[PDB]
Amino acid sequence: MGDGDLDVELETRREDEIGDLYAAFDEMRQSVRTSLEDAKNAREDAEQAQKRAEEINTELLEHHHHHH
Structure with missing residues (x-):
């Protein structure tokens, strides 16, 4: 007994201040609204900037025209 x-100091160590105990209904409502697709867009554009320099005849892979 x-x-x-x-x-x-923290008690039992079953929670490391992981954010399930406390947060805010404003920053969590905008941080998930856009960020992951912008990080994807930046990482993808920084790779595509090396690939555009090889030409590949890119415009002939679309060739928008009426030719029946």
């Missing part, structure tokens, strides 16, 4: 749990 009177013993079993302690470690009152």
Whole structure:
């Protein structure tokens, strides 16, 4: 009796301040609204900037025209 749990710095270590205990209904409503697709767009454009320099005849892979 009177013993079993302690470690009152944080207590039991079952939660490392992971954000499930406290957050805010404004930053979490805009941080997920756009960021992952913008990081994708930046990483993709920075690769495509090396590939556009090889030509590949890119415009002939579309060739928008009426030719029946």
